[PDB]
Amino acid sequence: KNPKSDKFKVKRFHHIEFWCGDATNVARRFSWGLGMRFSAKSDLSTGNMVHASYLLTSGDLRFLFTAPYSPSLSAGEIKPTTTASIPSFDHGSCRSFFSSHGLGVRAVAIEVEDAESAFSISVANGAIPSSPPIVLNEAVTIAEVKLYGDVVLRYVSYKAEFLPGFERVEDASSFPLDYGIRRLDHAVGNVPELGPALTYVAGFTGFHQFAEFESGLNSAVLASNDEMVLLPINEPVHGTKRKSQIQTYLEHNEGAGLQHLALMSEDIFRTLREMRKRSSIGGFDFMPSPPPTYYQNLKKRVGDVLSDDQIKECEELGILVDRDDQGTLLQIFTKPLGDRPTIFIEIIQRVGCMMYQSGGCGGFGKGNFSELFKSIEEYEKT
Amino acid sequence: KNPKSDKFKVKRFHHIEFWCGDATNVARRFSWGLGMRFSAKSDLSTGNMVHASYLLTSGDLRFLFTAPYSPSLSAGEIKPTTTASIPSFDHGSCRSFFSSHGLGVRAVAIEVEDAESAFSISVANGAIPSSPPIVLNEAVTIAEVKLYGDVVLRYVSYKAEFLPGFERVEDASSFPLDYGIRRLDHAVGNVPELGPALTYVAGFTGFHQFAEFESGLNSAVLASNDEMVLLPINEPVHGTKRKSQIQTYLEHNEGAGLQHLALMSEDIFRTLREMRKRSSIGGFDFMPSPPPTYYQNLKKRVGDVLSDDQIKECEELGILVDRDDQGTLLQIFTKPLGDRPTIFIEIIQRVGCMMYQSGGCGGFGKGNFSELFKSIEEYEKT
Ligand SMILES: Cc1cc(C(=O)C2=C(O)CCCC2=O)cc2c(=O)n(Cc3ccccc3)c(=O)n(C)c12
Ligand SMILES: Cc1cc(C(=O)C2=C(O)CCCC2=O)cc2c(=O)n(Cc3ccccc3)c(=O)n(C)c12
Ligand SMILES: [Co+2]
Ligand SMILES: [Co+2]
Numbered sequence: 001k002n003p004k005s006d007k008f009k010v011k012r013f014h015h016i017e018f019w020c021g022d023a024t025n026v027a028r029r030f031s032w033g034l035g036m037r038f039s040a041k042s043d044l045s046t047g048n049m050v051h052a053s054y055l056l057t058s059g060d061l062r063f064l065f066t067a068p069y070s071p072s073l074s075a076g077e078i079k080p081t082t083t084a085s086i087p088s089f090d091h092g093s094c095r096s097f098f099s100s101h102g103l104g105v106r107a108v109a110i111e112v113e114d115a116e117s118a119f120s121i122s123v124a125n126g127a128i129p130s131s132p133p134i135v136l137n138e139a140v141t142i143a144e145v146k147l148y149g150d151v152v153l154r155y156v157s158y159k160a161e162f163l164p165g166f167e168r169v170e171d172a173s174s175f176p177l178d179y180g181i182r183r184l185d186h187a188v189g190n191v192p193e194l195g196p197a198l199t200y201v202a203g204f205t206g207f208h209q210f211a212e213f214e215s216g217l218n219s220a221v222l223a224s225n226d227e228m229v230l231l232p233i234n235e236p237v238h239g240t241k242r243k244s245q246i247q248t249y250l251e252h253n254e255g256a257g258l259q260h261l262a263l264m265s266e267d268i269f270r271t272l273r274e275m276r277k278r279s280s281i282g283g284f285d286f287m288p289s290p291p292p293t294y295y296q297n298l299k300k301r302v303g304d305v306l307s308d309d310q311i312k313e314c315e316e317l318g319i320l321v322d323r324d325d326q327g328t329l330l331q332i333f334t335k336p337l338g339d340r341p342t343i344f345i346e347i348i349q350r351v352g353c354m355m356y357q358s359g360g361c362g363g364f365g366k367g368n369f370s371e372l373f374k375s376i377e378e379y380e381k382t
Numbered sequence: 383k384n385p386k387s388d389k390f391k392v393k394r395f396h397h398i399e400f401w402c403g404d405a406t407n408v409a410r411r412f413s414w415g416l417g418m419r420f421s422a423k424s425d426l427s428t429g430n431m432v433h434a435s436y437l438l439t440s441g442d443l444r445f446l447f448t449a450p451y452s453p454s455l456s457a458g459e460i461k462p463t464t465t466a467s468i469p470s471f472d473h474g475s476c477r478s479f480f481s482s483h484g485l486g487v488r489a490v491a492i493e494v495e496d497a498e499s500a501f502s503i504s505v506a507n508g509a510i511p512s513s514p515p516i517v518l519n520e521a522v523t524i525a526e527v528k529l530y531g532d533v534v535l536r537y538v539s540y541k542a543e544f545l546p547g548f549e550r551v552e553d554a555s556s557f558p559l560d561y562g563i564r565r566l567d568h569a570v571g572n573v574p575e576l577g578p579a580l581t582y583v584a585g586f587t588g589f590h591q592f593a594e595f596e597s598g599l600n601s602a603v604l605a606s607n608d609e610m611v612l613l614p615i616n617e618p619v620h621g622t623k624r625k626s627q628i629q630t631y632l633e634h635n636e637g638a639g640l641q642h643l644a645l646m647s648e649d650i651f652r653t654l655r656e657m658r659k660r661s662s663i664g665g666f667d668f669m670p671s672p673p674p675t676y677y678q679n680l681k682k683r684v685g686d687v688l689s690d691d692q693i694k695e696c697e698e699l700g701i702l703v704d705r706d707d708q709g710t711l712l713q714i715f716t717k718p719l720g721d722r723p724t725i726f727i728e729i730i731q732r733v734g735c736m737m738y739q740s741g742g743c744g745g746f747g748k749g750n751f752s753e754l755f756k757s758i759e760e761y762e763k764t
Binding site for chain 1: 402403404405406407408410411412413414415420425426434449451452454455477480481482484485554555556557559633634636662663664665667719720721722723
């Protein structure tokens, strides 16, 4: 059931913004680890005395990395005279965010038809304002409302290239890395209580519950009208044999925040070969692979969608496979991206649901939890 | 003249500690960029609830990267019951350092015979104490005194493997990168006034002025008895045509601090080929190369030490060459390591002064300033 109740016109995910201590080192690490190209910058060299911001791109995926300079560089400025290219930025907010949470996502940005209308309608329907709409060079409008914890939902609308005040990076410094990642599929939050969090966000967006088809979490997914903007939210399940990773997140993050970003690949085998080659030379590590009993039991449930050769290839790369009623999901998870056991990345590819491909085709892998438990027990039973 | 006046027995540089916001991303970037291997760790996985610390090594060079966790993880601990492996660490100090200075060196650590005696003698001779001597697992003693700004000189002494509480990293996660870097040659501070800074440091160490043989700086070098621990200090020269990079540093760093680390390579051509290959894929960028008039004029002054083929090879890699009265210096500088125009790295190799090689063989390249000015003018005169 898709009631199509968006209170304003939503298009697609636009970018994800990380708040960092040093944007340069995080951006370079992420670029090499994920195969994303340096695309634009806003920093001292472009006249920004407030923050250093670097944009990486792969396909339509946009990762922005931002860190504050010394406030002394901009002490004479006021908001009307700021050299910040992101006018919602605040030194104190950014340092407080990073001290509290460590490296993590500050903004989940979606493109809308009219960011001022989106902000107004959102706030009229219960959204906590974070930064009011501001028109940049008469060309782009940006506004922010609270999503959960200290994460904001950022509305961006274009009249008619990332943001005014950003510069294309020179091709010499812009190496065309590409491991196959193409777009953000979903962005997942961890909260202490799912109920109030769902009611709040669905209250001000009009996003609807996206239907799914006992290991530490209850979850629900909010979706835009065409189900291309997907925002799952998890809460912990307490009193379990194994401690909930949702609870671990909330402890180490100092509360609610963004848990994982799922990045769609146009070829998950190529992406995983390329990322795994780089795991121990500056890139990203992956969670421990499932036991081979998991891949022994895969032919019995997706053997009509994947050949034995491609099931073998999943076993090499440690890829997980789940089946919906409409499509199939290939997925794998990185270890945490930074010092804390908080944010991580998921790589995914979906097969099925062609009309273009409809959103959330194959679900989110909820079945892979019990399937991993069963497979682990069978391997250890042997 | 070497009066050999060390007030306590100094051995060699032991490690450099960076204070970070996220130690994981900086360490992985540096590892790939410089060819340093992951060697040891102290973090949640080793029971450290206070700070995440990762050690990279190349030859005898040791880079340590440390960032604070949420203080909530260790709120019940007191100093007698701490799980920190570096007992001088303090959450507030580390966050204040990073907010003030951004990514940078907190500690220049030298190995001594007796860290408690070194601390006592240093303080008796004017050193400002930073952290008192503490004996770790009855095996290693560490103490800290202020060096300049918020940089500390760290004394380490061993009775008889980095530090107690650190663990060797698994070989799977420890890839044997190596671009030829072998040891720290010198560590350079920027101060507002050279005079008081020299008097302070030479006052409490007994280090002596190391002799040298008009572009923004006055400098002087302090050296240990065998001149293997070398600590240059710069001050700005004001009222110049071009603004002093020393002054720029002091502005963006919010005061005095460590300006550059010079890393000795056993083969600077191999190191530079390897680092330059990686500049745009997560590694380090280098300063703009000199005009070819510089390499045209090199045969006329080091043509007896380098062949025309190796002078050509310097031109490819952008290497600078300076001549002393005792040796020759090959050197090159990276762009700043992080967001701010503050700390950078120098790669060097020295040729001459064999007895082993004596320290500072060839100087520090002071002559390359005028030689670059002359060469630039000649190229542009054409
Ligand atoms: C199969 C599966 C699915 C998902 C997932 O994406 C997802 C949800 O289930 C809820 C709905 C929204 C959504 O998108 C996430 C994970 C996952 O995070 N971890 C990491 C983990 C980290 C630490 C301890 C234990 C496991 C997995 O191991 N699996 C097997 C996962
Ligand atoms: C020839 C040379 C030598 C040294 C150096 O190491 C050194 C000193 O001179 C003083 C004594 C201690 C010491 O060790 C440093 C640099 C250097 O930092 N930069 C970067 C720069 C960055 C921004 C603007 C302008 C230049 C150079 O361009 N050159 C040519 C250098
Ligand atoms: Co997911
Ligand atoms: Co130097």
